[PDB]
Nucleic acid binder design. Structure first.
Length: 1315
RNA sequence: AUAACUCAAUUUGUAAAAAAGUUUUAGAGCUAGAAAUAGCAAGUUAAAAUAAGGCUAGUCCGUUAUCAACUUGAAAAAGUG
DNA sequence: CAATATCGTTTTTTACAAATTGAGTTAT
DNA sequence: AAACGATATTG
């Protein structure tokens, strides 16, 4: 009877139904409602359109913040309860006056002045401590009893903005010694390098190093004062290290191995060892003197103050900003009074402008302020331009860059103060430790929410049932159980033994397994032997003992040279399981050898269980203390020093397989586990896959007896949730396409699926740094410039030709080429991973393969550097060099040309497996599946070529029909292919010398559609002789369907979700639009929110009052039920509406009208709801095919003959231009009703009738955005911007007819809103 | 087409933290003038909220997914041409 | 009532598991 | 990152 074609997209599912002649049936569907019609004819073609599914990411970030906010509230709430009793004596109303600081005087309960509750004290406080940092410093330094209130403020400010937790352990501020500490580096160097000492030279390390520039410059500046020493010289890189940077010590010391050290990465103790153990331990006291100068200079850029003057150098640093800002602003006033007085009001009164007023009172950033007076200053000062570059000019203390500041330095003052004032307040002494905890304490990430079983999100497990707090957390939260659950709730079960947890990737047993499985198919021959042979049991264990347990990685060259030669005495050997080196390696054995320094223990086979628990622990837990905790049992087996280093050794990653599978389950026969068979299987050297599939053994069936919704099922898949929206809708479409054919399943279903600025500047910034290249500090760029492919590429290649070797010219990009590495005529990859910039695609070598071996030779060296500079990926590097493995074999070639029309994407196959198992559900007599329906899958190239080649052209911007057209051409091409070539079923249909013919064949698979290349009019399958294509009638019946104007389009109506409103918190204003940020906060006094999201409009017919007397008038209107209001409304719709003003509401006439709800009006004009307030265009323009194809060609400047018979088609049919405008205008005037817009278009067209046919078509294609279904949008007719006519009312709809559609549009229910 | 491993890149989902930003109030503006309006001085800080809120009352939850109509359902979802 | 213009919270860091794509080894 | 629905402003 029939087949179904689908096109699955993120915003659309197009569908078609086709009969055996490739025709698409029409049919009469019932039409429900209260209308004149009881039926309608509908062609079974259409498309569902829908807004994108969104990721949970924004939802998550909002969520994680919501919680940061409720918890910083409880921090202050902890602090305040401690203070309550002694503060209820100094000042009854203090913690209240704070609470209501936000209220206008009128709504206040206590005195307006928060701190002291009168004007004279409050005024005085502000005079003495302009900023809270003034108060922080005094409270830390001073010894005087201080006011409980001024103490409680300093403390809360520290707790309420406690800075970051990115450093572990304790930070101690101690500069002062920087000059002596630098001269200890220069001394404890010149000891070692006796020959060529560095002149300490009274060089000002102090200033150069604690200057306010970058690290990478403070370095240049410091080797600038050192004569005849390079910034890459040994002392050069030490200084980079002392400064916090990541330098590379390799070329100094002649190493083959990279030696980079970041003092404040957690592997520094292990990397320095790896170096020192290579260069000698007589260099320990050089990475020592560079650590000493590091601890005095770590926090330069935050501190800016000699810590000899104050235990409070962070606040002092801030008071410094204050004084400077004051000093500099006094001076900047004076200077403007003298020199540019006309412009003074502007700078200092005007908040509109980014003057000092716009800085302070407006909304102007430091950046925008600094951008405004750069000019003014130099047109006038010398010192202020110094400060503006440094970004140090009229600084505020609360700023975007305080993200540096660790919780440790604020804990610093927080501590100082308590110590100071516990001398006077007994309760600050008794509670000093509670209060540092509030600053200090932080729920560990591996615990998560502190839920009591109303958190979907939560997993932590309670050691008790009390309330958790920063002080009782250890004793009430079972942190270990939680830490474990954090990881184990996310890890895979062994798919094979689903009861069993996958082992740690780095499990000693796991690695043994991984090596054996790979060592059991290593073959080898000598000269003497008749055939290549597997390894013997005995051999493996000797290979494993001598090679795997002394080298991290074992080479084939080690195998030949180190085992065979020196244990077998073969001068020759030919190995056949591995290449170059062994994929598997006992990574963990050597980790543990280097640490437990006892070979005999790791081998000893009774230690197995323990060492498998040590690694599990090293993997489950990344908290070093908890690791210590877990490892405690075994303290007795290895020295103090050896536990200190086991705990630091952490692992991540999980296996794919369990312990039971590998070395647990036995063969009944053998009493041998898998690992036993890998370790020795005699003459057969069976491998895991095999072992699990050979019926000679117990294993396959020990496994088989261990095995096991739709919406749930689709959401559990792996891909964008955007495409998973398509997937559901495509299925739901298919079930209505089945219902519509009277519950008859198709013979066939055909599915095809479809496929910035910041991340690029970091890829280059980082790239060029590591490369030691001047190109940035020589042609600065910005984030948004690198969206130019050619510019991006130029910079990713160090301004250098990828195929030649020679600078390129930033000013000649437009003359050079973006060549594809593996050519575009194999791989339709057009990403950075397959593109290169070069002065011509020529220099590549052959058009017909990877870049030549000549080129690979010359360039390889550079490609490596770019690879090492993360300026090319491994994928790109590997393609680039592939010519030096014979490049593209005539079978790799064939490989890709099949890949071009065969879907390999996992997600598409998931789609097919679902549709198959849903269509095919009945079993035969021998009890295998009866496959009633074939699920064909197609790449999107087939139907695009098919469209190019027979001139069924597509132009997306005309209307939404092409989604449906593609799905029809998918059912057509799809069913034809597997009619003509039933053997391609193995490749396209879901379920269970030669290379050049595979190519030529797949290359040409689609020929049977054509009459010449000479093929017969009628095409047939040679075996069954069934008809597959009648070139004399079938191309005609395609052209019919394409030209068919009534195609079923349908926007998915959708209840809106997300933010209540816009986020912006607006000044006060009289306006019923404004929304209360909290119940008591009338926005007429406090400001608040505008722009709520309508979750859905709702038709109210009721009565409202009118005029002084409260005469009931009668109304029918659309009321927008906002997202906030939604839960209220649904709980009691009448009550909600009554309180809005409505009366005698007719509850049975209440229509939910989601976004997009459809309305047909007067001349088949349609509108779709956007809001209770604004309508969208609801009509499609059915442009004739002749005009579509005209517009394709015209706009598009085969070969010369056809690219001429189709250019002479354009010139001959130029009447089509005026005809196409005539079309848009009969439509626009019937349905769009944008008089002035239509008339600027008519005008716009007429002026440009004098311009090439190509140009005039490119821009008629833009005119369709006047006529496009959905929200109006701006477009240009040439240089004529035509702003959007919008429908800013929903009244006209209120007596129109509501159309309620099925997903397919086929079934309807039209209601005639005249009631 | 599947399975283990290797190397790289990506995607999805979760938790813990940070800095700003905004909004009201507080930080006595001053000297003229009846008045509207001038001149000058000031400005860097702070409290609080940061989805309204919710009952389950947790140092929890609140912006993802899912949604034609009619009948049936809490619901998912079924029945309906 | 209709044309036109303005508007939209931003950014950091740490820890982790899972698919998937695609170059390679070994296998059903 | 737009796009498009909410606002104010404006004619």
């Amino acid at each position: 009877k029939y087949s179904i074609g689908l096109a699955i997209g993120t915003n659309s599912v197009g569908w078609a139904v086709i009969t055996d002649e490739y025709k698409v049936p029409s049919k009469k569907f019932k039409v429900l409602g209260n209308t004149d019609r009881h039926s309608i004819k509908k062609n079974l073609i259409g498309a569902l359109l829908f807004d994108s599914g969104e990721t949970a990411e924004a939802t998550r970030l909002k969520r994680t913040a919501r919680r940061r906010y409720t918890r910083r509230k409880n921090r202050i709430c902890y602090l305040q309860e401690i203070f309550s009793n002694e503060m209820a004596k100094v000042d009854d109303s203090f913690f209240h006056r704070l609470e209501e600081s936000f209220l206008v005087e009128e709504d206040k309960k206590h005195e307006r002045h928060p701190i002291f509750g009168n004007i004279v004290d409050e005024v005085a406080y502000h005079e003495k401590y302009p900023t809270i940092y003034h108060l922080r410093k005094k409270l830390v330094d001073s010894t005087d009893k201080a006011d409980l209130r001024l103490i409680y403020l300093a403390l809360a400010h520290m707790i309420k903005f406690r800075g970051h937790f990115l450093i572990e352990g304790d930070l101690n501020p101690d500069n002062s010694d920087v000059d002596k500490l630098f001269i200890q580096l220069v001394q404890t160097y010149n000891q070692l390098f006796e020959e060529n000492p560095i002149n300490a030279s009274g060089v000002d390390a102090k200033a150069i190093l604690s200057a306010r520039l970058s690290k990478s410059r403070r370095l240049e500046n410091l080797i600038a004062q050192l004569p005849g020493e390079k910034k890459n010289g040994l002392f050069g890189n030490l200084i980079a290290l002392s400064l916090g940077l990541t330098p590379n010590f390799k070329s100094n010391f002649d190493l083959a191995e990279d030696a980079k050290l970041q003092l404040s990465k957690d592997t520094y103790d292990d990397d320095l060892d790896n170096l020192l153990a290579q260069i000698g331990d007589q260099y320990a006291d050089l990475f020592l003197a560079a650590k000493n100068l590091s601890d005095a200079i770590l926090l330069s850029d935050i501190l800016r103050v000699n810590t000899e003057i104050t235990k409070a150098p962070l606040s002092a640093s801030m008071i410094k900003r204050y004084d400077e800002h004051h000093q500099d602003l006094t001076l900047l006033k004076a200077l403007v009074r003298q020199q540019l007085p006309e412009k003074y009001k502007e700078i200092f009164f005007d908040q509109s402008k980014n003057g000092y007023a716009g800085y302070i009172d407006g909304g102007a950033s430091q950046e925008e302020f600094y951008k405004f007076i750069k000019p003014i200053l130099e047109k006038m000062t010398e010192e202020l331009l110094v400060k503006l570059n440094r970004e140090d000019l009229l600084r505020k203390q609360r700023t975007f860059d305080n993200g540096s500041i660790p919780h440790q330095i604020h804990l610093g003052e927080l501590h100082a103060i308590l110590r100071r004032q516990e001398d006077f307040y007994p309760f600050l002494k008794d509670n000093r430790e509670k209060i540092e905890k509030i600053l200090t304490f932080r729920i560990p990430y591996y615990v998560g929410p502190l839920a009591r079983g109303n958190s979907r999100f939560a997993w932590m497990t309670r050691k008790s049932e009390e309330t958790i707090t920063p002080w009782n957390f250890e004793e009430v939260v079972d942190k270990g159980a939680s830490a474990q659950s954090f990881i184990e709730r996310m890890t895979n079960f062994d798919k094979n033994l689903p009861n069993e947890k996958v082992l740690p990737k780095h499990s000693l047993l796991y690695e043994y397994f991984t090596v054996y499985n790979e060592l059991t198919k290593v073959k080898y021959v000598t000269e003497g032997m008749r055939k290549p042979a597997f390894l013997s049991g005995e051999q493996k264990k000797a290979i494993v003992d001598l090679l795997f347990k002394t080298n991290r990685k074992v080479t084939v060259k080690q195998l030949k040279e180190d085992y065979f030669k020196k244990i077998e005495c073969f001068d020759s050997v030919e190995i056949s399981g591995v290449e170059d080196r062994f994929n598997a390696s006992l990574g963990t054995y050597h980790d543990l050898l280097k640490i437990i320094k006892d070979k005999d223990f790791l081998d000893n086979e009774e230690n197995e269980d323990i060492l498998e628990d040590i690694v599990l622990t090293l993997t489950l837990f990344e908290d070093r203390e908890m690791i210590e905790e877990r490892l405690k049992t075994y303290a007795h087996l290895f020295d103090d020093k050896v536990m200190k280093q086991l705990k630091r050794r952490r692992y991540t990653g999980w296996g794919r397989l369990s312990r039971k599978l590998i070395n647990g389950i036995r063969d009944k026969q053998s009493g041998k586990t898998i690992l036993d068979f890998l370790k020795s299987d005699g003459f057969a050297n069976r491998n895991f896959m095999q072992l699990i599939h050979d019926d000679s053994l117990t294993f396959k069936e020990d496994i088989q007896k261990a095995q096991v919704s739709l919406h749930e099922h689709i959401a559990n898949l792996a891909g964008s949730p955007a495409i998973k929206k398509g997937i559901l809708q495509t299925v739901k479409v298919v079930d209505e396409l089945v219902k519509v054919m009277g519950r008859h399943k198709p013979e066939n279903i055909v599915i095809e699926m479809a496929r910035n600025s910041r991340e690029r500047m970091k890829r280059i910034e980082e790239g060029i740094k590591e490369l030691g290249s001047q190109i940035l500090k020589e042609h600065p760029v910005e984030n948004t410039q690198l969206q130019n492919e050619k510019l991006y590429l130029y910079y990713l290649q160090n301004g250098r030709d990828m195929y030649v070797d020679q600078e390129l010219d930033i000013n000649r990009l437009s003359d050079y080429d973006v060549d594809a590495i593996v050519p575009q005529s194999f791989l339709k990859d057009d990403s950075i991973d397959n593109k290169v910039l070069t002065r011509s695609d020529k220099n590549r070598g052959k058009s017909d393969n990877v870049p030549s071996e000549e080129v690979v030779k010359k360039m390889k060296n550079y490609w490596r550097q770019l690879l090492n500079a993360k300026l090319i990926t491994q994928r790109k590097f590997d393609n680039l060099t592939k010519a030096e493995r014979g490049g593209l074999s005539e079978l790799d070639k064939a490989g890709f040309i099949k890949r071009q029309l065969v879907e390999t994407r996992q997600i598409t196959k998931h789609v097919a497996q679902i549709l198959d198992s849903r269509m095919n559900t009945k079993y035969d007599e021998n009890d295998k599946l009866i496959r009633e329906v074939k699920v064909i899958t197609l790449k999107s190239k087939l139907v695009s070529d098919f469209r190019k080649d027979f001139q069924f052209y597509k132009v997306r911007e005309i209307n939404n029909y092409h989604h449906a057209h593609d799905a029809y051409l998918n059912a057509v091409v799809g069913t034809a292919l597997i009619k003509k070539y039933p053997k391609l079923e193995s490749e396209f249909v879901y379920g269970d010398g030669k290379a050049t013919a595979k190519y030529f064949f797949y290359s040409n698979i689609m020929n049977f559609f054509k009459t010449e290349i000479k093929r017969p009019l009628i095409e047939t399958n040679g075996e069954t002789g069934e008809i597959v294509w009648d070139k004399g009638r079938d191309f005609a019946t395609v052209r019919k369907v394409l030209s068919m104007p009534q195609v079923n389009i349908v926007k998915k109506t959708e209840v809106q979700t997300g933010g209540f409103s816009k986020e912006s918190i607006l000044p006060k204003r009289n306006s019923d639009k404004l929304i209360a940020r909290k119940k008591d906060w009338d926005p007429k006094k406090y400001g608040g929110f505008d722009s709520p999201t309508v979750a859905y409009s709702v038709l109210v017919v009721a009565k409202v009052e009118k005029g002084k007397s409260k005469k009931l008038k009668s109304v029918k209107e659309l009321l927008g039920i906002t997202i906030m209001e939604r839960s209220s409304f649904e709980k009691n719709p009448i009550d909600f509406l009554e309180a809005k003003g409505y009366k005698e509401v007719k509850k049975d006439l209440i229509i939910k009208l989601p976004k997009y709800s459809l309305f047909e009006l007067e001349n088949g004009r349609k509108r779709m709801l956007a809001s209770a307030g604004e309508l969208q265009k609801g009509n499609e323009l059915a442009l004739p095919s002749k005009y579509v194809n005209f517009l394709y060609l015209a706009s598009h400047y085969g070969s010369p003959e056809d690219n001429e018979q189709k250019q002479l088609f354009v010139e001959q049919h130029k009447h089509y231009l005026d005809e196409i405008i005539e079309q848009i205008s009969e439509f626009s005037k019937r349905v769009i009703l944008a008089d002035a817009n239509l008339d600027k278009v008519l005008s716009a067209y007429n002026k440009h009738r004098d311009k090439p046919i190509r140009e005039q078509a490119e821009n008629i294609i833009h005119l369709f955005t006047l006529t496009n279904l959905g929200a109006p949008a701006a477009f240009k007719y040439f240089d004529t911007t035509i702003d959007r006519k919008r429908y800013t009312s929903t009244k006209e709809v209120l007596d129109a007819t509501l159309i309620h559609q099925s997903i397919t549009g086929l079934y309807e229910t039209r209601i005639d809103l005249s009631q």
